[PDB]
Amino acid sequence: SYMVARMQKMKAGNLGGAFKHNERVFETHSNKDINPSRSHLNYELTDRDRSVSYEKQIKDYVNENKVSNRAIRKDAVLCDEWIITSDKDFFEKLDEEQTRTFFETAKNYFAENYGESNIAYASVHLDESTPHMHMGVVPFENGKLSSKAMFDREELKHIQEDLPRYMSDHGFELERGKLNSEAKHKTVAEFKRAMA
DNA sequence: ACTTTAT
DNA sequence: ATAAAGTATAGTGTG
Ligand SMILES: [Cl-]
Ligand SMILES: [Cl-]
Ligand SMILES: [Cl-]
Ligand SMILES: [Mn+2]
């Protein structure tokens, strides 16, 4: 089984949908693969207030801590949302407790390397095809918000090697992705079209 | 390395 | 006029 770890940049205009979907606020889902009978099985790993939006939480955190007087730019990357997962076979092997420990462990990796107070949310979904986590990492450091500074080319190449290794050291049997892999990312909807 | 942003 | 942070990046799977 491969360790699946990948980030998507979230601007203020993305976080509204990310909040509503991650929290499962609508009863109907366009995703035919969400099982609403299973949604009460999901859980959140941070101690965040569920009544507070991601955009509000993150903006408040950055404004209250940033060293500059200048406003957060309208196009700022407020957080990097990491999907943490593996394949179906990997999770088939694990009980509820081990599965939670798996996501808590991925989360510790990012807390330890990028700052505990930067893990804005850690939403574990068990109501879709495969257990996975949406974890929002605020790229905030030395009083500055900059995804550019935190997750550059060398950093993403480091995580692909070091994250699977850290999971392995903590008891999880999965390997890193292919080094220099030539895969092109497809969206969930695109990937589904690919399969049949 | 080239633009966009908010001073 | 300036400079920080915007643009991708690295990885696999039905997020
Ligand atoms: Cl909160
Ligand atoms: Cl200032
Ligand atoms: Cl999609
Ligand atoms: Mn999900």
PDB file of all heavy atoms in Angstrom, chain A residues 6-11 77 80 146-156, chain B residues 1, chain C residues 5-11:
ATOM      1  N   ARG A   6      -1.187  14.580  -0.172  1.00  0.00           N
ATOM      2  CA  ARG A   6      -1.161  15.591  -1.191  1.00  0.00           C
ATOM      3  C   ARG A   6      -1.906  16.849  -0.725  1.00  0.00           C
ATOM      4  O   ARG A   6      -2.908  16.734  -0.025  1.00  0.00           O
ATOM      5  CB  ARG A   6      -1.739  14.966  -2.454  1.00  0.00           C
ATOM      6  CG  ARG A   6      -2.913  15.685  -3.030  1.00  0.00           C
ATOM      7  CD  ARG A   6      -3.161  15.143  -4.402  1.00  0.00           C
ATOM      8  NE  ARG A   6      -2.424  15.892  -5.400  1.00  0.00           N
ATOM      9  CZ  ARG A   6      -2.821  17.050  -5.925  1.00  0.00           C
ATOM     10  NH1 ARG A   6      -3.943  17.629  -5.524  1.00  0.00           N
ATOM     11  NH2 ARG A   6      -2.078  17.623  -6.854  1.00  0.00           N
ATOM     12  N   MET A   7      -1.428  18.042  -1.100  1.00  0.00           N
ATOM     13  CA  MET A   7      -2.060  19.270  -0.634  1.00  0.00           C
ATOM     14  C   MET A   7      -2.741  20.040  -1.732  1.00  0.00           C
ATOM     15  O   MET A   7      -2.315  20.024  -2.875  1.00  0.00           O
ATOM     16  CB  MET A   7      -1.089  20.193   0.126  1.00  0.00           C
ATOM     17  CG  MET A   7       0.192  20.532  -0.609  1.00  0.00           C
ATOM     18  SD  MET A   7       0.906  22.090  -0.034  1.00  0.00           S
ATOM     19  CE  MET A   7       0.173  23.185  -1.246  1.00  0.00           C
ATOM     20  N   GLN A   8      -3.795  20.743  -1.353  1.00  0.00           N
ATOM     21  CA  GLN A   8      -4.473  21.660  -2.256  1.00  0.00           C
ATOM     22  C   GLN A   8      -4.545  23.021  -1.556  1.00  0.00           C
ATOM     23  O   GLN A   8      -4.923  23.118  -0.358  1.00  0.00           O
ATOM     24  CB  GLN A   8      -5.885  21.138  -2.593  1.00  0.00           C
ATOM     25  CG  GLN A   8      -6.675  22.000  -3.578  1.00  0.00           C
ATOM     26  CD  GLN A   8      -8.184  21.817  -3.479  1.00  0.00           C
ATOM     27  OE1 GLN A   8      -8.675  20.788  -3.023  1.00  0.00           O
ATOM     28  NE2 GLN A   8      -8.933  22.825  -3.925  1.00  0.00           N
ATOM     29  N   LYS A   9      -4.165  24.074  -2.287  1.00  0.00           N
ATOM     30  CA  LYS A   9      -4.177  25.446  -1.769  1.00  0.00           C
ATOM     31  C   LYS A   9      -5.623  25.972  -1.580  1.00  0.00           C
ATOM     32  O   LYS A   9      -6.474  25.815  -2.456  1.00  0.00           O
ATOM     33  CB  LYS A   9      -3.380  26.405  -2.659  1.00  0.00           C
ATOM     34  CG  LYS A   9      -1.883  26.137  -2.790  1.00  0.00           C
ATOM     35  CD  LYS A   9      -1.293  26.969  -3.949  1.00  0.00           C
ATOM     36  CE  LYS A   9       0.238  26.956  -3.979  1.00  0.00           C
ATOM     37  NZ  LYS A   9       0.805  27.570  -5.213  1.00  0.00           N
ATOM     38  N   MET A  10      -5.905  26.542  -0.411  1.00  0.00           N
ATOM     39  CA  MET A  10      -7.258  27.033  -0.106  1.00  0.00           C
ATOM     40  C   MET A  10      -7.193  28.539   0.094  1.00  0.00           C
ATOM     41  O   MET A  10      -6.561  29.006   1.027  1.00  0.00           O
ATOM     42  CB  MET A  10      -7.806  26.349   1.152  1.00  0.00           C
ATOM     43  CG  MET A  10      -7.665  24.810   1.146  1.00  0.00           C
ATOM     44  SD  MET A  10      -8.833  23.964   0.035  1.00  0.00           S
ATOM     45  CE  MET A  10     -10.347  24.696   0.623  1.00  0.00           C
ATOM     46  N   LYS A  11      -7.803  29.273  -0.826  1.00  0.00           N
ATOM     47  CA  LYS A  11      -8.021  30.695  -0.682  1.00  0.00           C
ATOM     48  C   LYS A  11      -9.330  30.931   0.085  1.00  0.00           C
ATOM     49  O   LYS A  11     -10.069  29.967   0.317  1.00  0.00           O
ATOM     50  CB  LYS A  11      -8.046  31.338  -2.065  1.00  0.00           C
ATOM     51  CG  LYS A  11      -6.682  31.241  -2.743  1.00  0.00           C
ATOM     52  CD  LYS A  11      -6.665  31.928  -4.078  1.00  0.00           C
ATOM     53  CE  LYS A  11      -5.430  31.464  -4.834  1.00  0.00           C
ATOM     54  NZ  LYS A  11      -4.378  32.497  -4.793  1.00  0.00           N
ATOM     55  N   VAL A  77      -3.110  32.280   0.086  1.00  0.00           N
ATOM     56  CA  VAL A  77      -3.367  30.911   0.533  1.00  0.00           C
ATOM     57  C   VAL A  77      -3.561  30.831   2.057  1.00  0.00           C
ATOM     58  O   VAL A  77      -2.588  30.796   2.834  1.00  0.00           O
ATOM     59  CB  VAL A  77      -2.231  29.964   0.112  1.00  0.00           C
ATOM     60  CG1 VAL A  77      -2.569  28.527   0.481  1.00  0.00           C
ATOM     61  CG2 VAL A  77      -1.974  30.089  -1.395  1.00  0.00           C
ATOM     62  N   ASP A  80      -3.227  25.129   3.526  1.00  0.00           N
ATOM     63  CA  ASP A  80      -2.911  24.027   2.612  1.00  0.00           C
ATOM     64  C   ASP A  80      -3.666  22.813   3.121  1.00  0.00           C
ATOM     65  O   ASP A  80      -3.403  22.334   4.251  1.00  0.00           O
ATOM     66  CB  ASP A  80      -1.399  23.789   2.531  1.00  0.00           C
ATOM     67  CG  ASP A  80      -0.649  25.050   2.091  1.00  0.00           C
ATOM     68  OD1 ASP A  80      -0.726  25.422   0.895  1.00  0.00           O
ATOM     69  OD2 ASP A  80      -0.012  25.706   2.957  1.00  0.00           O
ATOM     70  N   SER A 146       2.662  32.426   4.405  1.00  0.00           N
ATOM     71  CA  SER A 146       3.200  32.231   3.078  1.00  0.00           C
ATOM     72  C   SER A 146       3.341  30.749   2.797  1.00  0.00           C
ATOM     73  O   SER A 146       4.290  30.091   3.289  1.00  0.00           O
ATOM     74  CB  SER A 146       4.569  32.921   2.967  1.00  0.00           C
ATOM     75  OG  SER A 146       5.171  32.717   1.697  1.00  0.00           O
ATOM     76  N   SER A 147       2.407  30.246   2.003  1.00  0.00           N
ATOM     77  CA  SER A 147       2.494  28.899   1.488  1.00  0.00           C
ATOM     78  C   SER A 147       3.726  28.763   0.596  1.00  0.00           C
ATOM     79  O   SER A 147       4.388  27.698   0.543  1.00  0.00           O
ATOM     80  CB  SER A 147       1.229  28.583   0.702  1.00  0.00           C
ATOM     81  OG  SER A 147       1.227  27.250   0.234  1.00  0.00           O
ATOM     82  N   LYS A 148       4.044  29.848  -0.097  1.00  0.00           N
ATOM     83  CA  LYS A 148       5.186  29.909  -0.955  1.00  0.00           C
ATOM     84  C   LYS A 148       6.455  29.563  -0.163  1.00  0.00           C
ATOM     85  O   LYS A 148       7.274  28.747  -0.610  1.00  0.00           O
ATOM     86  CB  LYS A 148       5.301  31.305  -1.543  1.00  0.00           C
ATOM     87  CG  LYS A 148       6.526  31.430  -2.425  1.00  0.00           C
ATOM     88  CD  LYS A 148       6.641  32.796  -3.043  1.00  0.00           C
ATOM     89  CE  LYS A 148       7.863  32.839  -3.922  1.00  0.00           C
ATOM     90  NZ  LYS A 148       8.167  34.241  -4.267  1.00  0.00           N
ATOM     91  N   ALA A 149       6.630  30.205   0.990  1.00  0.00           N
ATOM     92  CA  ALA A 149       7.773  29.935   1.852  1.00  0.00           C
ATOM     93  C   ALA A 149       7.698  28.524   2.507  1.00  0.00           C
ATOM     94  O   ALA A 149       8.712  27.887   2.666  1.00  0.00           O
ATOM     95  CB  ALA A 149       7.935  31.040   2.914  1.00  0.00           C
ATOM     96  N   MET A 150       6.522  28.034   2.891  1.00  0.00           N
ATOM     97  CA  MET A 150       6.476  26.777   3.647  1.00  0.00           C
ATOM     98  C   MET A 150       6.547  25.483   2.761  1.00  0.00           C
ATOM     99  O   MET A 150       7.359  24.557   3.005  1.00  0.00           O
ATOM    100  CB  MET A 150       5.245  26.779   4.557  1.00  0.00           C
ATOM    101  CG  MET A 150       5.113  25.533   5.419  1.00  0.00           C
ATOM    102  SD  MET A 150       3.858  25.519   6.749  1.00  0.00           S
ATOM    103  CE  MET A 150       4.592  26.703   7.878  1.00  0.00           C
ATOM    104  N   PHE A 151       5.684  25.413   1.748  1.00  0.00           N
ATOM    105  CA  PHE A 151       5.604  24.250   0.894  1.00  0.00           C
ATOM    106  C   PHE A 151       6.087  24.602  -0.516  1.00  0.00           C
ATOM    107  O   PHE A 151       5.275  24.869  -1.426  1.00  0.00           O
ATOM    108  CB  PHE A 151       4.181  23.723   0.877  1.00  0.00           C
ATOM    109  CG  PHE A 151       3.695  23.291   2.231  1.00  0.00           C
ATOM    110  CD1 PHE A 151       2.662  23.989   2.878  1.00  0.00           C
ATOM    111  CD2 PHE A 151       4.261  22.211   2.872  1.00  0.00           C
ATOM    112  CE1 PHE A 151       2.215  23.594   4.138  1.00  0.00           C
ATOM    113  CE2 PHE A 151       3.828  21.828   4.131  1.00  0.00           C
ATOM    114  CZ  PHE A 151       2.798  22.513   4.768  1.00  0.00           C
ATOM    115  N   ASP A 152       7.404  24.668  -0.663  1.00  0.00           N
ATOM    116  CA  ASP A 152       8.024  24.805  -1.967  1.00  0.00           C
ATOM    117  C   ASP A 152       8.369  23.425  -2.581  1.00  0.00           C
ATOM    118  O   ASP A 152       7.996  22.395  -2.029  1.00  0.00           O
ATOM    119  CB  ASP A 152       9.257  25.702  -1.866  1.00  0.00           C
ATOM    120  CG  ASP A 152      10.335  25.124  -0.959  1.00  0.00           C
ATOM    121  OD1 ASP A 152      10.169  24.004  -0.417  1.00  0.00           O
ATOM    122  OD2 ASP A 152      11.358  25.822  -0.772  1.00  0.00           O
ATOM    123  N   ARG A 153       9.076  23.417  -3.713  1.00  0.00           N
ATOM    124  CA  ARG A 153       9.377  22.178  -4.425  1.00  0.00           C
ATOM    125  C   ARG A 153      10.151  21.164  -3.544  1.00  0.00           C
ATOM    126  O   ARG A 153       9.786  19.961  -3.507  1.00  0.00           O
ATOM    127  CB  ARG A 153      10.103  22.447  -5.758  1.00  0.00           C
ATOM    128  CG  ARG A 153      10.176  21.219  -6.671  1.00  0.00           C
ATOM    129  CD  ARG A 153      10.766  21.516  -8.053  1.00  0.00           C
ATOM    130  NE  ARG A 153      10.039  22.626  -8.693  1.00  0.00           N
ATOM    131  CZ  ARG A 153       9.496  22.631  -9.917  1.00  0.00           C
ATOM    132  NH1 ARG A 153       9.591  21.580 -10.728  1.00  0.00           N
ATOM    133  NH2 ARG A 153       8.859  23.725 -10.338  1.00  0.00           N
ATOM    134  N   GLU A 154      11.183  21.660  -2.840  1.00  0.00           N
ATOM    135  CA  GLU A 154      12.080  20.809  -2.043  1.00  0.00           C
ATOM    136  C   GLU A 154      11.337  20.234  -0.843  1.00  0.00           C
ATOM    137  O   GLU A 154      11.529  19.085  -0.484  1.00  0.00           O
ATOM    138  CB  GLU A 154      13.366  21.557  -1.624  1.00  0.00           C
ATOM    139  CG  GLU A 154      13.126  22.780  -0.734  1.00  0.00           C
ATOM    140  CD  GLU A 154      14.305  23.756  -0.682  1.00  0.00           C
ATOM    141  OE1 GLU A 154      15.469  23.286  -0.673  1.00  0.00           O
ATOM    142  OE2 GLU A 154      14.067  24.992  -0.643  1.00  0.00           O
ATOM    143  N   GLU A 155      10.458  21.036  -0.260  1.00  0.00           N
ATOM    144  CA  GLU A 155       9.666  20.612   0.861  1.00  0.00           C
ATOM    145  C   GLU A 155       8.693  19.479   0.466  1.00  0.00           C
ATOM    146  O   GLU A 155       8.623  18.488   1.170  1.00  0.00           O
ATOM    147  CB  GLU A 155       8.891  21.772   1.474  1.00  0.00           C
ATOM    148  CG  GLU A 155       8.342  21.430   2.853  1.00  0.00           C
ATOM    149  CD  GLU A 155       9.441  21.289   3.922  1.00  0.00           C
ATOM    150  OE1 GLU A 155      10.548  21.819   3.734  1.00  0.00           O
ATOM    151  OE2 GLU A 155       9.218  20.642   4.965  1.00  0.00           O
ATOM    152  N   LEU A 156       7.949  19.636  -0.632  1.00  0.00           N
ATOM    153  CA  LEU A 156       7.031  18.588  -1.068  1.00  0.00           C
ATOM    154  C   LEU A 156       7.798  17.264  -1.402  1.00  0.00           C
ATOM    155  O   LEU A 156       7.313  16.169  -1.087  1.00  0.00           O
ATOM    156  CB  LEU A 156       6.159  19.092  -2.206  1.00  0.00           C
ATOM    157  CG  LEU A 156       5.094  20.170  -1.880  1.00  0.00           C
ATOM    158  CD1 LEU A 156       4.333  20.551  -3.150  1.00  0.00           C
ATOM    159  CD2 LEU A 156       4.105  19.756  -0.805  1.00  0.00           C
TER     160      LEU A 156
ATOM    161  O5'  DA B   1      14.784  33.262 -12.143  1.00  0.00           O
ATOM    162  C5'  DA B   1      14.485  32.757 -13.464  1.00  0.00           C
ATOM    163  C4'  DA B   1      13.257  33.439 -14.030  1.00  0.00           C
ATOM    164  O4'  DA B   1      12.080  33.052 -13.281  1.00  0.00           O
ATOM    165  C3'  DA B   1      13.273  34.966 -14.010  1.00  0.00           C
ATOM    166  O3'  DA B   1      12.583  35.403 -15.194  1.00  0.00           O
ATOM    167  C2'  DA B   1      12.551  35.294 -12.713  1.00  0.00           C
ATOM    168  C1'  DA B   1      11.501  34.189 -12.639  1.00  0.00           C
ATOM    169  N9   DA B   1      11.118  33.783 -11.286  1.00  0.00           N
ATOM    170  C8   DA B   1      11.953  33.658 -10.203  1.00  0.00           C
ATOM    171  N7   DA B   1      11.353  33.228  -9.121  1.00  0.00           N
ATOM    172  C5   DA B   1      10.037  33.040  -9.520  1.00  0.00           C
ATOM    173  C6   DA B   1       8.891  32.592  -8.829  1.00  0.00           C
ATOM    174  N6   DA B   1       8.892  32.246  -7.541  1.00  0.00           N
ATOM    175  N1   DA B   1       7.731  32.514  -9.520  1.00  0.00           N
ATOM    176  C2   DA B   1       7.730  32.875 -10.812  1.00  0.00           C
ATOM    177  N3   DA B   1       8.739  33.314 -11.569  1.00  0.00           N
ATOM    178  C4   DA B   1       9.879  33.369 -10.855  1.00  0.00           C
TER     179       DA B   1
ATOM    180  P    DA C   5       5.419  37.042   3.217  1.00  0.00           P
ATOM    181  OP1  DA C   5       4.580  37.103   4.440  1.00  0.00           O
ATOM    182  OP2  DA C   5       6.636  36.194   3.239  1.00  0.00           O
ATOM    183  O5'  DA C   5       4.540  36.599   1.959  1.00  0.00           O
ATOM    184  C5'  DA C   5       3.241  37.155   1.754  1.00  0.00           C
ATOM    185  C4'  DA C   5       2.685  36.723   0.418  1.00  0.00           C
ATOM    186  O4'  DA C   5       3.434  37.342  -0.660  1.00  0.00           O
ATOM    187  C3'  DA C   5       2.714  35.210   0.149  1.00  0.00           C
ATOM    188  O3'  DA C   5       1.428  34.920  -0.424  1.00  0.00           O
ATOM    189  C2'  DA C   5       3.819  35.052  -0.887  1.00  0.00           C
ATOM    190  C1'  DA C   5       3.664  36.354  -1.656  1.00  0.00           C
ATOM    191  N9   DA C   5       4.820  36.753  -2.467  1.00  0.00           N
ATOM    192  C8   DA C   5       6.150  36.510  -2.220  1.00  0.00           C
ATOM    193  N7   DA C   5       6.950  36.934  -3.168  1.00  0.00           N
ATOM    194  C5   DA C   5       6.087  37.461  -4.121  1.00  0.00           C
ATOM    195  C6   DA C   5       6.311  38.051  -5.380  1.00  0.00           C
ATOM    196  N6   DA C   5       7.526  38.248  -5.902  1.00  0.00           N
ATOM    197  N1   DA C   5       5.233  38.488  -6.068  1.00  0.00           N
ATOM    198  C2   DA C   5       4.018  38.306  -5.536  1.00  0.00           C
ATOM    199  N3   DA C   5       3.680  37.753  -4.375  1.00  0.00           N
ATOM    200  C4   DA C   5       4.773  37.359  -3.701  1.00  0.00           C
ATOM    201  P    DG C   6       0.893  33.428  -0.634  1.00  0.00           P
ATOM    202  OP1  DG C   6      -0.367  33.305   0.133  1.00  0.00           O
ATOM    203  OP2  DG C   6       2.011  32.474  -0.399  1.00  0.00           O
ATOM    204  O5'  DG C   6       0.483  33.398  -2.167  1.00  0.00           O
ATOM    205  C5'  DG C   6      -0.716  34.060  -2.600  1.00  0.00           C
ATOM    206  C4'  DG C   6      -0.665  34.326  -4.085  1.00  0.00           C
ATOM    207  O4'  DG C   6       0.329  35.319  -4.421  1.00  0.00           O
ATOM    208  C3'  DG C   6      -0.274  33.135  -4.937  1.00  0.00           C
ATOM    209  O3'  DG C   6      -1.403  32.284  -5.074  1.00  0.00           O
ATOM    210  C2'  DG C   6       0.080  33.821  -6.242  1.00  0.00           C
ATOM    211  C1'  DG C   6       0.814  35.058  -5.736  1.00  0.00           C
ATOM    212  N9   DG C   6       2.261  34.881  -5.659  1.00  0.00           N
ATOM    213  C8   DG C   6       3.002  34.501  -4.564  1.00  0.00           C
ATOM    214  N7   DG C   6       4.283  34.435  -4.810  1.00  0.00           N
ATOM    215  C5   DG C   6       4.395  34.784  -6.150  1.00  0.00           C
ATOM    216  C6   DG C   6       5.541  34.887  -6.985  1.00  0.00           C
ATOM    217  O6   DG C   6       6.729  34.715  -6.692  1.00  0.00           O
ATOM    218  N1   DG C   6       5.198  35.254  -8.283  1.00  0.00           N
ATOM    219  C2   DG C   6       3.923  35.504  -8.723  1.00  0.00           C
ATOM    220  N2   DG C   6       3.800  35.836 -10.017  1.00  0.00           N
ATOM    221  N3   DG C   6       2.847  35.427  -7.953  1.00  0.00           N
ATOM    222  C4   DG C   6       3.156  35.074  -6.686  1.00  0.00           C
ATOM    223  P    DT C   7      -1.208  30.736  -5.370  1.00  0.00           P
ATOM    224  OP1  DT C   7      -2.561  30.138  -5.343  1.00  0.00           O
ATOM    225  OP2  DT C   7      -0.121  30.219  -4.479  1.00  0.00           O
ATOM    226  O5'  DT C   7      -0.644  30.701  -6.864  1.00  0.00           O
ATOM    227  C5'  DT C   7      -1.438  31.026  -8.017  1.00  0.00           C
ATOM    228  C4'  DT C   7      -0.578  30.912  -9.257  1.00  0.00           C
ATOM    229  O4'  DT C   7       0.487  31.904  -9.221  1.00  0.00           O
ATOM    230  C3'  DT C   7       0.148  29.581  -9.398  1.00  0.00           C
ATOM    231  O3'  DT C   7      -0.685  28.557  -9.962  1.00  0.00           O
ATOM    232  C2'  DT C   7       1.304  29.951 -10.302  1.00  0.00           C
ATOM    233  C1'  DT C   7       1.661  31.358  -9.829  1.00  0.00           C
ATOM    234  N1   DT C   7       2.803  31.437  -8.851  1.00  0.00           N
ATOM    235  C2   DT C   7       4.022  31.829  -9.371  1.00  0.00           C
ATOM    236  O2   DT C   7       4.184  32.131 -10.540  1.00  0.00           O
ATOM    237  N3   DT C   7       5.045  31.879  -8.459  1.00  0.00           N
ATOM    238  C4   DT C   7       4.989  31.560  -7.120  1.00  0.00           C
ATOM    239  O4   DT C   7       6.001  31.664  -6.428  1.00  0.00           O
ATOM    240  C5   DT C   7       3.679  31.149  -6.636  1.00  0.00           C
ATOM    241  C7   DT C   7       3.515  30.810  -5.187  1.00  0.00           C
ATOM    242  C6   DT C   7       2.666  31.107  -7.516  1.00  0.00           C
ATOM    243  P    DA C   8      -0.729  27.055  -9.329  1.00  0.00           P
ATOM    244  OP1  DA C   8      -1.827  26.314  -9.959  1.00  0.00           O
ATOM    245  OP2  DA C   8      -0.646  27.107  -7.843  1.00  0.00           O
ATOM    246  O5'  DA C   8       0.653  26.407  -9.782  1.00  0.00           O
ATOM    247  C5'  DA C   8       1.133  26.394 -11.130  1.00  0.00           C
ATOM    248  C4'  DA C   8       2.318  25.458 -11.164  1.00  0.00           C
ATOM    249  O4'  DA C   8       3.358  25.966 -10.298  1.00  0.00           O
ATOM    250  C3'  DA C   8       2.019  24.046 -10.670  1.00  0.00           C
ATOM    251  O3'  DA C   8       2.787  23.132 -11.450  1.00  0.00           O
ATOM    252  C2'  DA C   8       2.541  24.037  -9.245  1.00  0.00           C
ATOM    253  C1'  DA C   8       3.697  25.012  -9.301  1.00  0.00           C
ATOM    254  N9   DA C   8       3.890  25.737  -8.048  1.00  0.00           N
ATOM    255  C8   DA C   8       2.925  26.336  -7.276  1.00  0.00           C
ATOM    256  N7   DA C   8       3.399  26.937  -6.212  1.00  0.00           N
ATOM    257  C5   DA C   8       4.768  26.721  -6.288  1.00  0.00           C
ATOM    258  C6   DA C   8       5.833  27.095  -5.450  1.00  0.00           C
ATOM    259  N6   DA C   8       5.677  27.768  -4.312  1.00  0.00           N
ATOM    260  N1   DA C   8       7.080  26.729  -5.818  1.00  0.00           N
ATOM    261  C2   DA C   8       7.233  26.003  -6.932  1.00  0.00           C
ATOM    262  N3   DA C   8       6.312  25.592  -7.803  1.00  0.00           N
ATOM    263  C4   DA C   8       5.086  25.996  -7.422  1.00  0.00           C
ATOM    264  P    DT C   9       2.691  21.552 -11.183  1.00  0.00           P
ATOM    265  OP1  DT C   9       3.117  20.888 -12.444  1.00  0.00           O
ATOM    266  OP2  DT C   9       1.373  21.242 -10.565  1.00  0.00           O
ATOM    267  O5'  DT C   9       3.798  21.299 -10.063  1.00  0.00           O
ATOM    268  C5'  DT C   9       5.149  21.687 -10.307  1.00  0.00           C
ATOM    269  C4'  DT C   9       5.950  21.504  -9.044  1.00  0.00           C
ATOM    270  O4'  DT C   9       5.539  22.478  -8.074  1.00  0.00           O
ATOM    271  C3'  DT C   9       5.820  20.142  -8.365  1.00  0.00           C
ATOM    272  O3'  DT C   9       7.158  19.772  -8.110  1.00  0.00           O
ATOM    273  C2'  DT C   9       5.296  20.452  -6.978  1.00  0.00           C
ATOM    274  C1'  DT C   9       5.642  21.913  -6.800  1.00  0.00           C
ATOM    275  N1   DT C   9       4.710  22.626  -5.934  1.00  0.00           N
ATOM    276  C2   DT C   9       5.253  23.400  -4.939  1.00  0.00           C
ATOM    277  O2   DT C   9       6.455  23.546  -4.794  1.00  0.00           O
ATOM    278  N3   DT C   9       4.333  24.024  -4.132  1.00  0.00           N
ATOM    279  C4   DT C   9       2.956  23.931  -4.209  1.00  0.00           C
ATOM    280  O4   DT C   9       2.258  24.554  -3.415  1.00  0.00           O
ATOM    281  C5   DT C   9       2.452  23.085  -5.271  1.00  0.00           C
ATOM    282  C7   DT C   9       0.972  22.930  -5.441  1.00  0.00           C
ATOM    283  C6   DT C   9       3.344  22.486  -6.073  1.00  0.00           C
ATOM    284  P    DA C  10       7.726  18.354  -8.593  1.00  0.00           P
ATOM    285  OP1  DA C  10       9.216  18.459  -8.564  1.00  0.00           O
ATOM    286  OP2  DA C  10       6.981  17.956  -9.827  1.00  0.00           O
ATOM    287  O5'  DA C  10       7.270  17.366  -7.434  1.00  0.00           O
ATOM    288  C5'  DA C  10       8.051  17.216  -6.241  1.00  0.00           C
ATOM    289  C4'  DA C  10       7.358  16.251  -5.309  1.00  0.00           C
ATOM    290  O4'  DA C  10       6.100  16.813  -4.877  1.00  0.00           O
ATOM    291  C3'  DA C  10       7.023  14.897  -5.932  1.00  0.00           C
ATOM    292  O3'  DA C  10       7.441  13.900  -5.003  1.00  0.00           O
ATOM    293  C2'  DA C  10       5.517  14.947  -6.141  1.00  0.00           C
ATOM    294  C1'  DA C  10       5.062  15.858  -5.022  1.00  0.00           C
ATOM    295  N9   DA C  10       3.836  16.613  -5.261  1.00  0.00           N
ATOM    296  C8   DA C  10       3.449  17.249  -6.415  1.00  0.00           C
ATOM    297  N7   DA C  10       2.359  17.967  -6.281  1.00  0.00           N
ATOM    298  C5   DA C  10       2.024  17.822  -4.941  1.00  0.00           C
ATOM    299  C6   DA C  10       0.960  18.331  -4.166  1.00  0.00           C
ATOM    300  N6   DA C  10      -0.006  19.119  -4.654  1.00  0.00           N
ATOM    301  N1   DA C  10       0.929  18.011  -2.853  1.00  0.00           N
ATOM    302  C2   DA C  10       1.888  17.208  -2.366  1.00  0.00           C
ATOM    303  N3   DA C  10       2.929  16.655  -2.996  1.00  0.00           N
ATOM    304  C4   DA C  10       2.945  17.016  -4.293  1.00  0.00           C
ATOM    305  P    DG C  11       8.046  12.556  -5.531  1.00  0.00           P
ATOM    306  OP1  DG C  11       9.246  12.240  -4.735  1.00  0.00           O
ATOM    307  OP2  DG C  11       8.115  12.638  -7.022  1.00  0.00           O
ATOM    308  O5'  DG C  11       6.940  11.479  -5.098  1.00  0.00           O
ATOM    309  C5'  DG C  11       5.848  11.115  -5.974  1.00  0.00           C
ATOM    310  C4'  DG C  11       4.612  10.851  -5.146  1.00  0.00           C
ATOM    311  O4'  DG C  11       4.101  12.101  -4.635  1.00  0.00           O
ATOM    312  C3'  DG C  11       3.433  10.228  -5.889  1.00  0.00           C
ATOM    313  O3'  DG C  11       3.632   8.814  -5.961  1.00  0.00           O
ATOM    314  C2'  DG C  11       2.279  10.605  -4.983  1.00  0.00           C
ATOM    315  C1'  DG C  11       2.701  11.973  -4.424  1.00  0.00           C
ATOM    316  N9   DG C  11       2.020  13.104  -5.057  1.00  0.00           N
ATOM    317  C8   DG C  11       1.103  13.930  -4.447  1.00  0.00           C
ATOM    318  N7   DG C  11       0.587  14.808  -5.261  1.00  0.00           N
ATOM    319  C5   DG C  11       1.186  14.544  -6.485  1.00  0.00           C
ATOM    320  C6   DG C  11       1.030  15.185  -7.743  1.00  0.00           C
ATOM    321  O6   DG C  11       0.269  16.110  -8.045  1.00  0.00           O
ATOM    322  N1   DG C  11       1.835  14.601  -8.722  1.00  0.00           N
ATOM    323  C2   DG C  11       2.691  13.545  -8.512  1.00  0.00           C
ATOM    324  N2   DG C  11       3.364  13.101  -9.583  1.00  0.00           N
ATOM    325  N3   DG C  11       2.861  12.956  -7.339  1.00  0.00           N
ATOM    326  C4   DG C  11       2.072  13.493  -6.380  1.00  0.00           C
TER     327       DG C  11
END
